[PDB]
Amino acid sequence: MKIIILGAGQVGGTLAENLVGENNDITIVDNVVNGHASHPDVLHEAGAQDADMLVAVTNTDETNMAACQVAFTLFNTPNRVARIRSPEYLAEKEALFKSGAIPVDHRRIMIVGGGNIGASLAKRLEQTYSVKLIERDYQRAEKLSEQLENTIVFCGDAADQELLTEENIDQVDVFIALTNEDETNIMSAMLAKRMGAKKVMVLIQRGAYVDLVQGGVIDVAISPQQATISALLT
Amino acid sequence: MKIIILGAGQVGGTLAENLVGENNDITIVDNVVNGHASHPDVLHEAGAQDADMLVAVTNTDETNMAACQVAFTLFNTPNRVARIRSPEYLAEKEALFKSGAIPVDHRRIMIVGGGNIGASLAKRLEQTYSVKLIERDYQRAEKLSEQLENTIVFCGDAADQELLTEENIDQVDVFIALTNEDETNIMSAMLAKRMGAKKVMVLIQRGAYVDLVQGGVIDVAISPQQATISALLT
Amino acid sequence: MQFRSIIRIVGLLLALFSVTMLAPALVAGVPFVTTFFVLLFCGAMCWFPNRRHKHDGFLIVVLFWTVLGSAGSLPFLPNISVTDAFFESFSALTTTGATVILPKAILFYRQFLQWFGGMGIIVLAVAILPVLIAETAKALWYIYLSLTIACAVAFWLAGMTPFDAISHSFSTIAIGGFSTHDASMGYFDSYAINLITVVFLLISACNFTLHFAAFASGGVHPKYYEFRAFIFIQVLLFLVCFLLLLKHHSYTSPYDAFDQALFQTVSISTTAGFTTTGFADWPLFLPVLLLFSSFIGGCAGSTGGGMKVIRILLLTLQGARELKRLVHPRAVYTIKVGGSALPQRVVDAVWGFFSAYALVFVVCMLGLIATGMDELSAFSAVAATLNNLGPGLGEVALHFGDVNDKAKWVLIVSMLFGRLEIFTLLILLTPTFW
Known part of the structure; x- marks a missing residue:
């Protein structure tokens, strides 16, 4: 598995940290290859012809997009993953990316917090049963409520029992936490189980914590690595 | 002259304001056409097949670039001008834009200010004679201080006369102010003429001031409109 | 430990x-x-x-340079005293002409010592990079083969048997100034040898690190646009010799005057050490000027461990920038002489190196005179000693035997310091290092 990571920021570096090993050959480009991530020669010097995955996590969507275009057109680099922060681009994700124009490859339910991937999975499971979206924020929850349909939108604080116990915690089949507070989520999940919640799904944004969650009373852990590394490792 | 302006922000709107008249048909797209500036239908609805110029001044370079690509590929829209704020893209402007990959079309000298177009005119005139770059700022200067060559850099305060009179203002052929907030520039130039400066070049951001500069003692005015509108209106 | x-x-x-x-x-x-x-x-x-x-690591480099005379003096206790034997050993051993005064095999070995000294210093110099894998052996071997073969064949062409040509070639590998006869070139002067040797002198001592790309297939040799300053100095040297010759109207014939005169000026100047004149047809100032010429020595990435074009160039050109500072302190100065924007990090150490170097120079002059040596003959000797050419021409008493043997040890350390970076020894003496 030959991996090129464009941009060694927090995301690129942390990724690189999680992928070093025997079956993985990691190259990182940042201005190791010192140069501009979307320049044909910089990309060539990182061995884009032979590589099996390209991950673009630079400062800019336009550089990520340019890198994936340049890599594809010049070296036919398979599996091109790119970070795109702009909702404007995603609004046309079908026509722009999924057409290969820009060659980028990549009874009661209750979720607490909003995750983009979580929204996707929540969109995969809200067809079968109604989903209680609970969100901390007020503006985001309201905007989200107008924006999306087929889901039930609530608000409330999660660090106090007067909302989750209020909401008949025995009458709900799962508690899913999308909050990005790392572990708080873990002891708050232990506590969540303590109040009588049936199933606690926890946001855990590291795949190096596997040894830390391994001897846990927490009945399911969830890493964004196991998916976002898999689209390349598919 | 059929003009489409993508994005009606400060720049798009002000442009639209300057330009309304008999020989100009202005259409502005913003999310008048309500939609995403780089969507094929939004662009079609603004009449990109027939138009004579684009101007892409949205929030994002990647949308500006996408708009120019989509417009060119689908409607062959001539004269495509785009705002690109990212130095990373301009660093490869030759290979990216000037190749049509991304179809975007667009004795002592003394300058005070580091204008980009004035870096260009300044780059056109520093070959013949040495140019005194004077800049107010320090952080913009300490990077620049060995970044560019064939020019002599300095620092100093514009209002501070002890700097312009210091260096024998009679021994210098021009005074070129690239500073923003033009009124000051207008008065300082007058002050500059009072000190004995030979020629005063003044940054004056809006073209629409021609009636305001017309009865002036200031011996040359400089508008960014007369050029940046001419690449389209020629 | x-x-x-x-x-x-x-x-x-x-x-x-x-x-x-x-x-x-x-x-x-x-x-x-x-x-x-x-x-x-x-x-x-x-x-x-x-x-x-x-x-x-510094201990390792000091230790590496400590071994070279641990087994270079044993066979000499050539019947001469122990201090003199050690001094003579170092004289043969170093690339220096420290003559105070042999078997055929020993003489061959002495020239061989010059061969050993000739290659060891360059490999160490390139090797300094980890503190500031052996694949360079083959490339250096090809270049070295070219140099030695060229010298031998060049000598062979001027009517001599291969053994004599090879002998002279061994003698000139690292140029002490030694020859078969203590007269450097007077004993044997065939014109071809003189012209060819002068060409060898110019090409051999200035720059080979730059041409290391010559080992690669690509031809990157047209590199005309170290070169400009250096040619100016040497050409100026030629003009001054021309002017001196015309003023004293020494030789009417072009070949003898140009070759002999040019040869003497270049040889003394280039730190080669081949000297066959006692500068009488020249004024006395010319020996003094030539001695100052001797102070300049080495080109970057070369055998000569002396002052270089880049250092002095930096001081004068950067000094020119300093002159500009004198004009106005409110003026930012950033100037790049050639390839790229130079950092202010490395540059202070160049002249801090020079300042410390001057301190060392004071130590050498003061110590050598102080130990009981004569003011003038030692004065010329210290200038010559730091450069590593040979003994002092001014007021000549080049061969000192009756000089203090402890001072002779000091002379050994001083000449070694001339070849080596002097500081390497210095770090050990400094308090708080321990």
């Missing part, structure tokens, strides 16, 4: 130095064979008791 690892590696180093000690024995040399055996015995004793290994 992990003494086993140091002991085994150091023992191996002495044994390795000793292996290259069979050179006289080819010419039917018992003490040199003995030195190989004794050091090999040293390596063997260190090697067998200890099996461990380590993996401070």
